[PDB]
Amino acid sequence: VNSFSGYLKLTDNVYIKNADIVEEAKKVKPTVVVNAANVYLKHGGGVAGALNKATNNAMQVESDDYIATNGPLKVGGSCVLSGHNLAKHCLHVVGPNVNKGEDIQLLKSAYENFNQHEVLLAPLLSAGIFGADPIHSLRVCVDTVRTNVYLAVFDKNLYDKLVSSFL
Ligand SMILES: O=C(O)c1csc(CCNC(=O)c2cc3nc[nH]c3cc2F)n1
């Protein structure tokens, strides 16, 4: 049993809810919240901008030190950093950004990072301002992630479309 509430069950291990991931993280304090990161960990907008704002920019400060030491992530890659006031840990995962021309096949590699964590609160990778089709992102998620993933979808209209079209 875990503390996630109000989710629709899509499969054995994937659950979904119309929710603001920031508010959901603040209430659950999950072990892992996933950020929709870019390779530079520049958390300017979308999910990343919202998560970072909720940490009062502490996420960005920590991220800048990480990049100064380690250099950029790979598209499809990830790193584990602090969850600050939102979670124990934040898994920063880089989905391909279609608006940068990045190969959508890397979306599966991005979701594979979730398998290193038994339970996660996450957004749909490469959705929103990353330009991919969220229906496709949900399909890749379901077909790739084997650990228990709680997906937060901010837009109610999109949430309803994702549920109604799910196979
Ligand atoms: O419906 C979805 O989940 C969806 C559609 S596009 C996309 C990526 C961009 N997300 C955001 O800008 C975003 C900003 C927030 N500010 C406060 N809480 C937020 C949650 C967010 F998700 N997510």
Domain extents in the chain: 8-165
Choice from 151, 154, 161 to test ligand 1 binding pocket (greatest atom count within 8 A of CB): 154
- Decide: 129 and 73 in contact? Cβ < 8 Å: no
User: What method was applied to determine this entry?
Assistant: X-ray
Cα of 48 vs centre of ligand 1, distance in Å, is 9
Start-end of H helices in 71-133 = 106-112
| Exposure b/e, 43-59, CB count within 10 A at least 16 = b | beebbbebbbebbeeeb
Q: Closest residue (by CA) to atom 8 of ligand 1?
A: 128
Atom of ligand 1 nearest to the CA of 155: 1
- Decide: 60 and 4 in contact? Cβ < 8 Å: no
User: Could you tell me if the CB of 158 is within 6 A of ligand 1?
Assistant: yes
Distance between CA atoms of residues 29 and 22, nearest Å: 10
User: Could you tell me if the CB of 34 is within 6 A of ligand 1?
Assistant: no
Atom of ligand 1 nearest to the CA of 134: 5
Question: Which strand (E) or helix (H) includes residue 121?
Answer: strand 119-122
The resolution, in Å, is 1.1
CATH class of 8-165: alpha beta
Start-end of H helices in the chain = 21-28, 46-54, 58-70, 106-112, 134-144, 156-164
